[PDB]
């Protein structure tokens, strides 16, 4: 997934030369430099008289991108006698197949025609040139005396080649023995030493080669493609070859023992004409030491979802088991007629992740069919079935499909940066492209929230620049990075994190950073490539509750990072890359809430106390009763809290003490149910933890009943909580009292009289009212000012009867109002008449007449009155004794409340007295 | 049901739910019920009949010509498939079914192109087929009265190692070695364009002569490709049964074999037969693969017959099973029975029928249930066999769509293999409601017209496009009595600034903040407002005869009037129904005593 698709290095050769048909690296152990080998099987050469003999070019890597030929040969056709040419090098396709190893370059010309020693002829045996150091030799194993099609005449040796671990060549010829094909393996040491230019049919002593077989096997093309690996544990590479046309064209692959060339295994294709065996490879793909086999079938026709067969190309992957058996999985192509599997090229460990990778090509796919190359990664249980990258050809056809990806080569590191590179051939456009592998960084990131559970009220932090105190929490982030290769010493990570991301979609913002950087924090980290997590942290504080409303969704901070590649690229401009599966973002959330615990119900503790405004209540009238109450919840929040007071029959609700600004303006109402009567008030929802309240309630007391001594009420506080939802019942009482504020009053009419009496005449005895003197009326009243009633009472009046043995005031009759009866100790109307300074006269100075009255029940405001009609006796004032005296006549009265109906309450007697007077003076002054 | 329970809106997701759901777009919408539901449930709420969308899938018929009875009629008139054009309309996830009839008509025009291998072992066959034109016409006159015959031959690519390139005179006489003469090498030559003149086939065959290839595999497939894609030179008719008889007695080359000879350029679907009737690109283009061969045989509607000797019959049977619309027959070495071979091959070929789906979009899927011989039905199959020719068969096609494609006017074709009589399908998807035009786009009910009838954004989209959630300075717009005060005075809860005040068995609450109620008024002298008023937001409103906060004071004066007629007898002042006697020496309720 890490190949540098941006700015690859491109090489091109002569136009129409098939440049890039076969590609490979060159590793001269004696020199520090490295080169690419590119084959041009149709380029013209300077060989005298040879037309399109082909050539192999060596292309530099550093600063030039130049390509130059390799002087494998510089001679035309050799002659046999004088003019009969020995060989025909024109159109031989030299450079069609290339392999290199250390400092050995092996190039083959599959189409070299040979004549023969026995007769004038023309047969394509094929030849190879092997350059080792400064020495160059020709290796033509099939150029033998097996004369014609019955033998090696049409061998076309060099069609496909490969080097072994043991420095031994493997070479395939598909045309030998009636096209049964042939594999030939010869040691490099012998090829370089046994070569003699003057002998054409050179015989090699240490040769391993297959041999013809029955007639059924004609036209199998054994040796079409070859690869080398060890498939029996003997330590020396064996030979893998694909026979695309065998078994009624099904196609097979042959595994031949690398020692003594015997047959070990044969893979069989599944669909005729699929060309199972066009390309093969062998590499360790799943961590076993055992080599795992890959086979391509570019023309395999898959059955689509609709039931149609369609050409997609298929690759078969076989995993070698310790017992030697193979477990096989088949991998299909991804677009029709793209020929997926035309080329397979192991890449080494493209990411150094511990398992080798493989690249597979579909040279006729993509847009405009410019070719595509897929990249797969080996996993511990086989190949990864999903490609991790795709390379697309950038060159459009000129006269032929570009065939980008027809031939690739991997498992070599031109950089020496630890990661293998990859070459790709696009010979249709005569170009070869080199892809470099970017260093891979694995990054581990850490995120921590302190605390994980967040109580809102944990005010700890102070806002800078102010005395404000704000709830806050600690959040810390960490990252750690390292990679297996040439990587810079220090890496600049740009990491940013913002708070509660998943609800910043236009909604309110909630938490802030210590500097209020819009819940957004971005910082650079110059992490040194190593093992340190290098954590860092900042403190985030929630803004005031009045500014946000989300108390349910947990705060979900978010953090992400990205590497500054332009600083992390080496001097050649190659940029690192992060691991494919490493996520560049991460987030965490905390539980910001107060929730009464898991059960979601708080446990309150409710209590109440009360004081009474009315210390004592007097029976007899409606009394407003005010109770002052303090309510408290010492426990957790109480949902739907209420204040409750139960009341008796003798009272009723009034309201609340609303005017008192020191008491709560409680909402209250009155209820009655099942003979139960109560007062209800609201304390809000919830009643918060530890909150205290004070309020006043108004009751009306209708205590006119006589046998009760006190009024009793019960208070309580309750809520809707499942736990402790009622406070203890708090009973309270107020004592009753008795108070009959009774007083005695009186008045006189007229208030004064003038002597001598106008129009009056003296007579021996009176017969009518006018005979005695002026009429005077006296009134006395017993009145109650208190609410309490009294069942019985007594009233007494004193009256001056005679002074100096002569009458002062004469009574005619007395009248009664209210519930009383009266009687006089002296006969009223004894004659039974026809109905200087002012001195004081009274019973203390004169003979006293007394009137006593009995009184029944009475109430507040009610009163009973005694009226008296009297005549002022005239003789006492017109006598000579008082002709120079002015008098004020005095009278007085008293009372007692003797009984009350409220016998159950403490009682005391109530008494008092008053006086009423009339004035008599001389209007006409007599002589002194 | 699903339509309601999914809670979708906008009439588009409602259609997307299920084919059964329907939508209502009344202006006078009734409240409290979802606008998305099946048609009957919408009609229960009395959504206007023209205001319900409820699109319904269907399958029409645009051309329904009858199947022909004979093939010798006017060429354009022959019709072997009915209906011929169909337009079907369906919802983003529904399915619909329709049927198709096919009848292999009798006496249909026939085109035979005898493509013949010409390797040296074919000389006896080339001798034996010198009368084949006339014999074949004589036999075929029973089956078809508009016959045509052609010819063409192939050996292999003319390039080493396939052909003898030495000694130098061998390339001009490949049979030079065995002391006899034969044609040079050639890939494929077009001999006789299809023609009705049967006799001229015999004339043209006699001018042929065999050649010589080095190896057994023949290059026939490259010949079949050109005989298929070079239709104008071959002369294939549009209205005829194309037979391509292929005769051989050896195995065949296949793609990617051309690499041995230096040929790497892949084959392509083009004609390269030059004006000299020789396939020109034989030496610069690889062999064609079975996939490409099958594609071009399907496009050009060619029935290909493999006539091959008994030694390679099985190979070509296994090859044929990979190429739809082909058969195999056994030739003698002398090729004595090719006539009967072709007759029986034609009979067998047209004794079956299979359907091709040509250009189906990825968003569709088809399933087939085939009515077959004797009115029997076979499920799952898209083909039938055992027909007697002339009979008729039919298939039940069932199609389902996958979601809502971004474009709703695609089309495709269904066609039997080997014939052009096809059914062309026009498909459209009803993703959008009609009300999406001219009705929904905008409405002033939402954000003063800034909302599709709604679909506005932050600030209004909280609900009915008139609620805010971007600012939250909250959903309790003035639910509390004053700024910062409890919501609804804690007498209930609110949304969008309106308190849903709670009810009680002992009273009920009103007001935007729940600040008023009908029970919180005062009591005095045993009853509320003294029985002289009524409660309103905690205050008493007193009657005409009463005053005071408790309604405790009477405004009347008849209780203060004295028998003399004066209020309080003029001795005091009346207050709350009683007289405050100011004059000393006077008493009574009105100071009248």
């Amino acid at each position: 997934f890490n190949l540098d698709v941006d700015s690859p290095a491109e090489y091109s050769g002569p136009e129409g030369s098939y440049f890039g048909f076969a590609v490979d690296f060159f590793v001269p152990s004696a020199s520090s430099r490295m080169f690419l080998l590119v084959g041009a099987p149709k380029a013209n050469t300077t060989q005298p008289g040879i037309v399109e003999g082909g050539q192999v070019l060596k292309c530099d890597w550093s600063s030039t991108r130049r390509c130059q030929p390799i002087e494998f040969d510089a001679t035309g056709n050799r002659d046999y006698a004088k003019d009969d040419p020995l060989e025909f090098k024109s159109h031989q396709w030299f450079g069609a197949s290339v392999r290199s190893k250390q400092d050995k370059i092996l190039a083959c010309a599959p189409l070299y025609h040979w004549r023969t020693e026995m007769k004038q002829e023309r047969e394509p045996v094929g030849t190879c040139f092997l350059q080792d150091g400064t020495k160059t030799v020709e290796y033509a194993p099939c150029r033998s005396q097996d004369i014609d099609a019955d033998g090696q005449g049409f061998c076309q040796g060099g069609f496909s080649i490969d080097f072994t671990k043991a420095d031994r060549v493997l070479l395939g010829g598909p045309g030998s023995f009636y096209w049964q094909g042939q594999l030939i393996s010869d040691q490099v040491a012998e090829i370089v030493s046994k070569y003699d230019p003057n002998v054409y049919s050179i015989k090699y002593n240490n040769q391993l080669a297959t041999r013809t077989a029955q007639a059924i096997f004609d036209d199998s093309y054994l040796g079409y493609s070859v690869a080398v690996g060890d498939f029996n544990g003997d330590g020396i590479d064996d030979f893998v070859s694909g026979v695309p046309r065998a078994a009624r064209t099904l196609g097979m692959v042959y595994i031949y023992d690398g020692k003594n060339m015997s047959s070990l295994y044969n893979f069989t294709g599944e669909q005729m004409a699929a060309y199972f065996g066009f390309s093969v490879a062998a590499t360790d793909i799943n961590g076993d030491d055992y080599a795992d086999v890959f086979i391509g079938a570019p023309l395999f026709m898959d059955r689509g979802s609709d039931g149609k067969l369609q050409e997609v190309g298929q690759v078969s992957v076989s995993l070698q088991r310790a017992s030697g058996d193979f477990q096989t999985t088949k991998l299909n192509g991804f677009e029709v007629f793209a020929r997926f599997g035309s080329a397979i090229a192991p890449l080494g460990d493209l990411d150094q992740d511990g398992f080798n990778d493989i690249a597979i090509a579909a040279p006729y796919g993509g847009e405009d069919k410019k070719g595509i190359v897929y990249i797969f990664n080996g996993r511990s249980t086989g190949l990864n079935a999903v490609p991790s990258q795709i390379l697309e050809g950038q060159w459009a056809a000129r006269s032929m499909p570009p065939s980008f990806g027809y031939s690739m080569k991997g498992a070599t590191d031109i950089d020496k940066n630890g990661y293998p590179d990859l070459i790709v051939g696009a010979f249709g456009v005569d170009r070869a492209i080199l892809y470099r592998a970017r260093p891979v960084i694995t990054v581990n990131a850490g995120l921590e929230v302190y605390p994980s559970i967040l109580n809102q009220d944990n005010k700890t932090c102070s806002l800078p620049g102010t005395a404000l105190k704000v709830s806050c929490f600690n959040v810390r982030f960490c990252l750690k990075a390292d990679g297996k290769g040439v990587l810079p010493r220090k890496l600049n990570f740009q990491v940013e994190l913002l708070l509660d991301k998943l609800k910043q979609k236009g909604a309110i913002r909630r938490a802030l950073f210590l500097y209020s950087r819009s819940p957004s924090h971005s910082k650079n980290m110059t992490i040194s490539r190593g093992g340190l997590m290098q954590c860092e942290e900042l403190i985030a504080y929630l803004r005031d509750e009045s500014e946000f409303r989300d108390k349910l969704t947990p705060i979900t901070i978010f953090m992400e990072y990205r590497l500054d590649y332009r600083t992390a690229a080496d001097t050649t401009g190659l940029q690192p890359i992060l691991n494919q599966f490493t996520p560049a973002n991460i987030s965490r959330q905390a539980h910001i809430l107060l929730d009464c615990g898991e059960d979601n119900v708080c446990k309150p503790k409710l209590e109440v106390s009360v004081d009474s405004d009315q210390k004592k209540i007097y029976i007899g009238d409606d009394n407003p009763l005010t109770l002052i109450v303090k309510a408290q919840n010492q426990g957790e929040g109480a949902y739907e809290a209420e204040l409750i007071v139960s009341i008796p029959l003798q009272a009723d609700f009034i309201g609340v003490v609303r005017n008192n600004e020191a008491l709560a303006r409680l909402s209250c109402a009155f209820k009655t149910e099942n003979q139960t009567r109560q007062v209800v008030c609201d304390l809000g929802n919830p009643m918060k933890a530890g909150t205290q309240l004070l309020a006043g309630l108004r009751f009306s007391v209708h205590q006119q009943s006589e046998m009760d001594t006190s009024v009793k009420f019960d208070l309580q506080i309750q809520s809707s909580n499942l736990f402790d939802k009622v406070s203890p019942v708090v009973s309270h009482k107020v004592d009753l009292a008795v108070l009959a504020a009774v007083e005695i009053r009186g008045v006189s009419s007229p208030d004064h009289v003038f002597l001598p009496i106008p129009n009056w005449e003296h007579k021996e005895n009176p017969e009518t009212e006018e005979d005695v003197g002026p009429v005077v009326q006296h009134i006395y009243e017993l009145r109650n000012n208190g609410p309490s009633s009294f069942s019985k009472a007594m009233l007494h009046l004193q009256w001056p009867y005679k002074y100096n043995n002569n009458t002062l005031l004469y009574i005619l009759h007395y009248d009664i109002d209210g519930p009383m009866n009266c009687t006089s100790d002296m006969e009223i109307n004894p004659l039974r008449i026809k109905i200087g300074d002012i001195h004081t006269l009274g019973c203390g100075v004169a003979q006293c007449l007394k009137i006593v009255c009995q009184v029944g029940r009475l109430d507040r405001g009610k009163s009973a009155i005694l009226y008296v009609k009297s005549l002022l006796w005239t003789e006492t004032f017109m006598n000579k004794e008082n002709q120079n005296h002015s008098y004020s006549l005095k009278s007085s009265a008293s009372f007692n409340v003797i009984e009350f109906p409220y016998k159950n309450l403490p009682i005391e007697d109530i008494t008092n007295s008053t006086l009423v007077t009339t004035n008599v003076t001389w209007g006409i002054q007599p002589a002194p | 049901n699903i339509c309601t329970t999914r809670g979708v809106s906008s009439c588009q997701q409602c259609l997307a739910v299920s084919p059964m759901c329907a939508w209502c777009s009344d202006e006078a919408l009734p409240l409290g019920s979802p606008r998305c539901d099946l048609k009957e449930n919408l009609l229960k709420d009395n959504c206007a009949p023209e205001s319900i969308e409820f699109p319904v899938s269907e399958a029409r018929v645009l051309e329904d010509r009858p199947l022909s009875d004979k093939g010798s009629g006017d060429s354009s008139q022959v019709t072997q498939v009915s209906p011929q054009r169909i337009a079907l309309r369906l919802r983003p996830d529904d399915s619909k079914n329709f049927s198709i009839q096919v009848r292999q008509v009798e006496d249909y025009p026939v085109d035979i192109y005898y493509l013949m291998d010409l390797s040296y072992s074919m000389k006896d066959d080339l001798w034996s087929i010198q009368n084949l034109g006339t014999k074949l016409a004589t036999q075929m006159r029973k089956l078809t009265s508009n016959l045509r015959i052609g010819f063409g031959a192939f050996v292999d690519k003319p390039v080493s190692p396939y052909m003898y390139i030495s000694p130098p005179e061998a390339l001009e006489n490949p049979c030079y070695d065995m002391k006899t003469t034969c044609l040079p090498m050639f890939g494929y030559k077009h001999v006789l364009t299809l023609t009705d003149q049967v006799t001229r086939f015999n004339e043209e065959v006699k001018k042929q002569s065999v050649s010589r290839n080095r190896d057994a595999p023949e290059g026939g497939f490259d010949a079949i490709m050109q005989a298929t894609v070079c239709d104008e030179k071959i002369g294939w008719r549009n209205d005829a049964s194309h037979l391509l008889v292929f005769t051989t007695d050896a195995k065949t080359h296949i793609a990617l074999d051309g690499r041995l000879a230096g040929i790497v350029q892949p084959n392509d679907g083009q004609c390269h037969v030059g004006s000299d009737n020789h396939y020109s690109a034989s030496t610069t283009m690889d062999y064609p693969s079975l996939g490409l061969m099958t594609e071009k045989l399907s496009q050009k509607n060619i029935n290909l017959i493999f006539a091959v000797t008994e030694n390679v019959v099985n190979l070509y049977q296994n090859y044929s099973e990979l190429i739809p619309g082909t058969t195999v027959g056994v030739l003698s070495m002398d090729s004595s029975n090719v006539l009967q071979l072709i007759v029986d091959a034609y009979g067998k070929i047209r004794s079956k029928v299979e359907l091709e789906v040509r250009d189906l979009p990825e968003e569709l899927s088809l399933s087939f249930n085939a009515t077959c011989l004797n009115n029997e039905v076979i499920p799952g199959l898209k083909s039938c066999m055992g027909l007697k020719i002339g009979d008729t068969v039919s298939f039940s096609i069932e199609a389902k769509v996958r979601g809502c494609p971004q474009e709703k006017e695609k089309s495709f074709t269904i066609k039997p293999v080997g014939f052009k009589d096809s059914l062309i399908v026009q498909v459209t998807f009803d993703c959008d409601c009609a009300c999406q035009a001219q009705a929904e786009p905008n409405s002033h009910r939402c954000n003063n017209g800034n909302g599709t009838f709604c679909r506005c954004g932050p600030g209004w989209l909280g609900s009915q496009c008139e609620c805010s959630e971007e600012d939250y300075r909250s959903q309790q717009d003035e639910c509390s009595p004053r700024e910062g005060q409890p919501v609804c005075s804690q007498r209930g809860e609110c949304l969008c600034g309106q308190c849903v005040c709670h009810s009680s068995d002992f009273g009920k609450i009103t007001g935007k903040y729940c600040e008023c109620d009908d029970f919180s008024c005062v009591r005095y002298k045993g009853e509320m407002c003294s029985g002289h008023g009524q409660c309103s937001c905690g205050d008493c409103l007193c009657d005409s005869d009463w005053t005071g906060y408790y309604c405790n004071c009477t405004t009347r004066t008849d209780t203060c009037m004295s028998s003399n007629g004066l209020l309080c007898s003029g001795r005091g002042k009346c207050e709350c129904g009683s007289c405050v006697c100011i004059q000393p020496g006077s008493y009574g309720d009105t100071c009248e005593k």
Side-chain angles (χ1 to χ4, degrees), chain B residues 408-591:
Chain B
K408 55 168 74 80
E409 62 175 44
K410 304 182 190 297
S411 57
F412 65 91
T413 67
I414 300 186
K415 181 180 73 66
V417 280
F419 290 103
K420 55 175 278 277
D421 300 83
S422 55
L423 168 54
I424 295 156
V425 183
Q426 290 153 221
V427 62
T428 285
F429 320 103
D430 277 352
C431 302
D432 291 306
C433 313
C435 67
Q436 286 169 222
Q438 175 189 352
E440 298 279 309
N442 296 80
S443 68
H444 203 82
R445 294 181 282 271
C446 299
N447 193 2
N448 309 313
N450 303 279
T452 303
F453 185 48
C454 277
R455 329 304 134 183
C456 62
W460 279 266
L461 91 179
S463 185
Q464 212 69 5
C465 268
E466 296 301 338
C467 177
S468 180
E469 86 300 339
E470 160 277 351
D471 211 352
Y472 253 76
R473 324 211 241 75
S474 216
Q475 312 325 122
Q476 53 100 59
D477 169 60
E478 310 178 333
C479 301
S480 60
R482 274 184 179 272
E483 64 299 337
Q485 308 313 300
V487 166
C488 305
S489 59
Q490 308 207 324
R491 286 168 155 204
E493 60 291 339
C494 79
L495 63 94
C496 199
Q498 294 188 5
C499 286
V500 186
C501 308
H502 288 180
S503 293
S504 183
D505 303 343
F506 302 86
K508 294 192 176 186
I509 303 175
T510 58
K512 184 175 186 175
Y513 334 103
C514 301
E515 71 283 357
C516 293
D517 56 73
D518 63 352
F519 60 82
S520 63
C521 293
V522 292
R523 278 203 182 211
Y524 180 62
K525 284 178 175 183
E527 294 197 327
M528 58 296 294
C529 312
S530 313
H532 306 150
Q534 294 194 357
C535 184
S536 181
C537 204
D539 298 318
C540 289
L541 294 175
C542 306
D543 293 344
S544 56
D545 295 26
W546 300 93
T547 190
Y549 190 69
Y550 304 95
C551 312
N552 45 291
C553 174
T554 184
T555 60
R556 295 182 73 103
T557 57
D558 61 338
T559 57
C560 284
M561 70 46 59
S562 305
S563 58
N564 52 58
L566 302 177
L567 298 184
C568 313
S569 294
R571 292 167 177 167
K573 296 178 180 177
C574 178
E575 296 196 341
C576 297
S578 299
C579 284
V580 175
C581 304
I582 296 167
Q583 172 58 44
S586 70
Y587 70 97
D589 300 350
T590 72
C591 326

Side-chain angles (χ1 to χ4, degrees), chain A residues 18 21 42 93 111 113 121-122 124 154 156 159 174 179 218-219 221 224 245 248-249 271-273 275 278 298-299 301 306 308-309 311 337 339 364 399-401 406 427 506-509 549 652-655 658 667-673 684-686 688 817 867, chain B residues 160-162 165-167 214-217 251-257 259-267 286-287 289-292 295 315 318-319 321-322 356-357 382 469-474 490-491 506 517 519-526 538-539 549-550 587:
Chain A
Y18 284 23
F21 190 83
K42 289 202 173 193
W93 275 59
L111 283 160
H113 290 79
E121 199 49 279
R122 199 165 174 161
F154 293 81
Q156 291 158 85
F159 195 88
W179 287 263
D218 304 353
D219 291 80
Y221 295 176
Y224 201 105
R245 282 194 60 99
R248 305 219 306 285
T249 321
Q271 188 183 81
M272 305 212 178
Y275 230 79
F278 182 75
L299 309 177
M301 271 165 38
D306 54 13
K308 289 182 68 178
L309 303 188
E311 274 187 33
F337 293 126
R339 299 194 177 182
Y364 304 125
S399 59
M400 168 162 17
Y406 196 75
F427 75 88
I508 189 57
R509 272 52 72 186
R549 180 39 301 162
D652 285 311
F653 185 49
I654 298 178
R658 298 177 175 166
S667 165
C668 298
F670 179 60
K671 324 302 142 61
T672 58
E673 174 174 27
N685 183 34
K688 322 333 168 285
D817 187 16
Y867 304 81
Chain B
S160 181
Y162 308 126
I165 64 165
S166 201
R214 184 171 273 122
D215 52 339
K251 67 194 80 163
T252 181
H253 271 298
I254 54 165
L256 301 168
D257 283 347
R259 193 174 173 175
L260 272 65
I263 303 172
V264 291
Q265 177 167 353
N267 207 278
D286 198 12
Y287 298 82
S289 55
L290 276 78
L292 188 59
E295 179 184 300
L315 172 60
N318 295 161
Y319 270 131
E321 285 173 8
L322 298 174
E356 263 198 320
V357 175
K382 66 203 296 184
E469 86 300 339
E470 160 277 351
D471 211 352
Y472 253 76
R473 324 211 241 75
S474 216
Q490 308 207 324
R491 286 168 155 204
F506 302 86
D517 56 73
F519 60 82
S520 63
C521 293
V522 292
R523 278 203 182 211
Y524 180 62
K525 284 178 175 183
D539 298 318
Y549 190 69
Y550 304 95
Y587 70 97

